[PDB]
Each structure stands twice: as structure tokens, then as C-alpha cells.
Write a protein that binds this DNA or RNA. Structure first.
Ligand SMILES: CC(/C=C/C(C)=C/[C@@H]1Cc2nc(cs2)CC[C@@H](N)CC(=O)O[C@@H](C)C/C(C)=C/C=C\C(=O)O1)=C\CN(C)C
Ligand SMILES: Nc1ncnc2c1ncn2[C@@H]1O[C@H](COP(=O)(O)OP(=O)(O)NP(=O)(O)O)[C@@H](O)[C@H]1O
Ligand SMILES: [Mg+2]
Length: 378
RNA sequence: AGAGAGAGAG
């Protein structure tokens, strides 16, 4: 089970070079437990706290099984969002820089002809895309499941929810029977575990209790607002505290993201907006300016709630509370990346305080009011 | 379930 370091995993001398070149030194908790089962060909259900290195878990696992001499698609990874797919693609190529393993992003909003040309020319060893463009190319027979022996679902609970389930099944129907299935997500509701019995041959169940998901490095607070109409002013009074680093402001609707943005712009406050109705060129720019520190504050929807990794981010503001119990975990997970110190602030009204109790009792975590010395905790 | 949030091409 346990492994001391990457060297003790029987990885190629060229793979261990790309791992340490990326910045790693010692495998995280889950990495020591799941990287070997995944390479051994077992169906794995890996659950771990946020920011613990689940992306590199399967990325290392995939890169080991890839018979680089075979120039065909051998692994398929699916993400609920495009931004996450692009992020996952870079992590794979990074860990396999000295290997020559080709990893292609098969996401929406990209140039179709360019992708069709790249696939017909060369077959990437690893596909990391979203269900839409992935199932499209499979239908056009530009992607071949013939040699796909590994099928990974990041944020599995979201990928197996009401909206994505039928999409995953349309893709799964085109895969072989012997295809290995790997599931990863910080959350794994019981209802989602009931459907894994439908398409997984008794996998390795690495699960975690809900009372232990709350990270210790993420401090959770709340602010009494009473009425919705005062949330704006409260956010502005926090502005100079937000710009202390990089902050993510979560809003439950696209329409409200644009409303708040135009309201803060009208007050001479630098904030960026991000949601799914924007053109893919806008989303790529906005996300670029955010990672490069150009923009410090970002007002977004649940699009960026899951998996988005920005180490510079150390503050998460919940302008609205999530309508999904599990989504709260992923939201706060954007700060305090891998042991770092992170802060989460929940703007709660009176009618919303009812909801906050459920979160505390569900995950067994107390969320105390914010002090004035919080600028030093960021 | 839907809504919300996401999730091909055009
Ligand atoms: C991003 C977005 C919208 C994304 C969609 C809509 C992404 C979808 C996801 C999937 N659904 C399914 C699988 S995969 C299940 C239904 C499936 N049977 C559809 C089908 O096979 O029809 C054929 C005929 C056409 C075809 C091969 C489609 C391939 C992919 C596809 O349908 O993409 C909208 C943005 N808003 C702002 C407008
Ligand atoms: N062995 C390692 N040592 C140190 N840092 C690491 C290691 N592996 C990964 N990381 C970093 O830790 C962070 C974790 O990111 P990620 O792999 O996305 O975890 P995650 O669990 O998938 N996040 P989430 O989707 O919200 O659960 C990233 O900044 C990685 O670069
Ligand atoms: Mg992740």
C-alpha cells in the first residue's frame, strides 16, 4: 500500500525526471495509496481532501501504462469543465516532458479543423477533454477507442450527476469491456456510489467520511448581512482585503455575475467576470490574466468551483451559498492549495443562516465570525 | 426530476 517516495514506485527513469522537474519531492497522502493500484490495472475510486494532488495521481498512473512505442490513444480523461480540462492537460505533459508522450486536449470552443487535423495526423497517447467534444470526435471516428484501456473521471460525482450521466454513458458505450475505470473527486455521495456498481468490477474503494473532508489549512468564516441588498457594500468594504492576494467570488447564476461586476466597475473596483455564456476566447483570456497575477479578484460561477488550481489564490468569498451540499467543499478548496493557508468567507443573510447550519452539522465543522486581524491570515 | 451550474459541431 504505502510508498515512501516516487523512486519506490518502479517508474521509468525518464518519468521520475519530469516529476521532480515539475516541483514534487514527496508523494501526498492519496498519491502514496492510489498511484500503484491505478498502474496495476484495477478499477479505482479515489477520494481525498481538496488540493492533495489528485490530478497528478492518475497523470502519473496513466503515463506508466502508456506503451509509448504504440502511437495510439490509450487513456481518456474527462472533466466537467473546459478550464479544468486544459489545466489537467498541462499537468500530464509536465510530468511526462522527458518521455515524448503526447497528450491532447479535446474540449469545446477550440478550433475544430485544427483538432481534426492533429488527430488524423498523430494519435495522442492521452486524451483529456470534456464529454461534448470527446463524444463528438468519437462519433466522427476521429478518436478511436480500439486501444483505450484506461478511462478516468475527474470530479466523478459531477460527471455522474443528472446532467452528465447520460453523456458519460454515451462515451462508455463506445469503450471496450476490459477498459479500466478510475474515479476521482473530493466528494462522493452515497447515491453516486450506488451507480458505480452498474459499471465497475468491484473497484478499490478509497473513501472518506464527510466529517473529515474540511481541510485544516482552510479557515472558514461568515459575515452577517441580514438582507441581500447589503451584500454589495460588504464586498466593497472587503475589497482592499481581497487584493491582498487573489480571491474568487462565487455567484450562483451567470446573470448575477454580470450584475455584480457592472456594479463594482461603476464604483471603480478592478474585478473580472467569468461564466459559461462567455465566448471561449474570453474565458481563456480571463483565466490567463488570473493565473499570471494580472487580475487579482475574479467573480465567477460554479464553473471554477471544481478542480481549478491557482496557488496564488488564498481567499474564497461565497457571495451566494451553494445550492448543492457537496459543491461547498470544492468552492473553498480553491484557496490554501496543498498545505498552504487559505481563508473562506460566507456572506450569509438571515434566511441563509438556516442553510449554514446544515453545512456545519453535515461536515462537523464550526464556522466562526470573521475578526479584524484576518488580513494577516490571508 | 427540473431549475441553477456545466457540458459537441454549426
Ligand atoms: C456548451 C453548450 C452545449 C454543449 C452540449 C450540448 C454538449 C453535448 C454533450 C453530450 N450529450 C450527450 C452526449 S455528449 C447525450 C446526447 C447525445 N445522444 C447527442 C447526440 O449524439 O446527437 C448527435 C446527433 C450529435 C452529436 C454527435 C453530439 C455530440 C456531443 C454532444 O451532444 O455534446 C452550450 C453553451 N450554451 C451557452 C449555449
Ligand atoms: N507530490 C506533491 N508534492 C507537493 N505538491 C504537490 C504534489 N503533487 C501535487 N502537488 C500540488 O498540489 C496541488 C494539488 O492540486 P490537484 O492535483 O488539483 O489536487 P486536487 O485534489 O485534484 N484539487 P481538487 O480537484 O479540488 O480536489 C497542486 O498545486 C499540485 O501542483
Ligand atoms: Mg482535481
Amino acid at each position: 500500500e504505502i510508498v515512501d517516495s516516487f523512486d519506490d514506485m518502479n517508474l521509468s527513469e525518464s518519468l521520475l525526471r519530469g516529476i521532480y522537474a515539475y516541483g514534487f519531492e514527496k508523494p501526498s497522502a492519496i498519491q502514496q495509496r492510489a498511484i500503484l493500484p491505478c498502474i496495476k490495472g484495477y478499477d479505482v475510486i479515489a477520494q481525498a481532501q481538496s488540493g492533495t494532488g489528485k490530478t497528478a495521481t492518475f497523470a502519473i498512473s496513466i503515463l506508466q501504462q502508456i506503451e509509448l512505442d504504440l502511437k495510439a490513444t490509450q487513456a481518456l480523461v474527462l472533466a466537467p469543465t473546459r478550464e479544468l480540462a486544459q489545466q489537467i492537460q498541462k499537468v500530464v505533459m509536465a510530468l511526462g516532458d522527458y518521455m515524448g508522450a503526447s497528450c491532447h486536449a479535446c474540449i469545446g470552443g477550440t478550433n475544430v479543423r485544427a483538432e481534426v487535423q492533429k488527430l488524423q495526423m498523430e494519435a495522442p497517447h492521452i486524451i483529456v477533454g470534456t464529454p461534448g467534444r470527446v463524444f463528438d470526435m468519437l462519433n466522427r471516428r476521429y478518436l478511436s477507442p480500439k486501444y483505450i484501456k484506461m478511462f478516468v473521471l475527474d470530479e466523478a460525482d459531477e460527471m455522474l450527476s443528472r446532467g452528465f450521466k447520460d453523456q458519460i454513458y454515451d462515451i462508455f458505450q463506445k469503450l471496450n469491456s476490459n477498459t479500466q475505470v478510475v474515479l476521482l473527486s473530493a466528494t462522493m455521495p452515497s447515491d453516486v456510489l450506488e451507480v458505480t456498481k452498474k459499471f465497475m468490477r468491484d473497484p478499490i474503494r478509497i473513501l472518506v467520511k464527510k466529517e473529515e473532508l474540511t481541510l485544516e489549512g482552510i479557515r472558514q468564516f461568515y459575515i452577517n448581512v441580514e438582507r441581500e441588498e447589503w451584500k454589495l457594500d460588504t464586498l466593497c468594504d472587503l475589497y482592499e482585503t481581497l487584493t491582498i492576494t487573489q480571491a474568487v467570488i462565487f455567484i450562483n447564476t451567470r446573470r448575477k455575475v454580470d450584475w455584480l461586476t457592472e456594479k463594482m466597475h461603476a464604483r471603480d473596483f478592478t474585478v473580472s467576470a467569468m461564466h459559461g455564456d462567455m465566448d471561449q476566447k474570453e474565458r481563456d483570456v480571463i483565466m490567463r490574466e488570473f493565473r499570471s497575477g494580472s487580475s487579482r479578484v475574479l467573480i465567477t460561477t460554479d464553473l471554477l468551483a471544481r478542480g481549478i488550481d491557482v496557488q496564488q489564490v488564498s481567499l474564497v468569498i461565497n457571495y451566494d451559498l451553494p445550492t448543492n451540499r457537496e459543491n461547498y467543499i470544492h468552492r473553498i478548496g480553491r484557496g490554501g492549495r496543498f498545505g498552504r493557508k487559505g481563508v473562506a468567507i460566507n456572506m450569509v443573510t438571515e434566511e441563509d443562516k438556516r442553510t449554514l447550519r446544515d453545512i456545519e452539522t453535515f461536515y462537523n465543522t464550526s464556522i466562526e465570525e470573521m475578526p479584524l486581524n484576518v488580513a494577516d491570515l490571508i
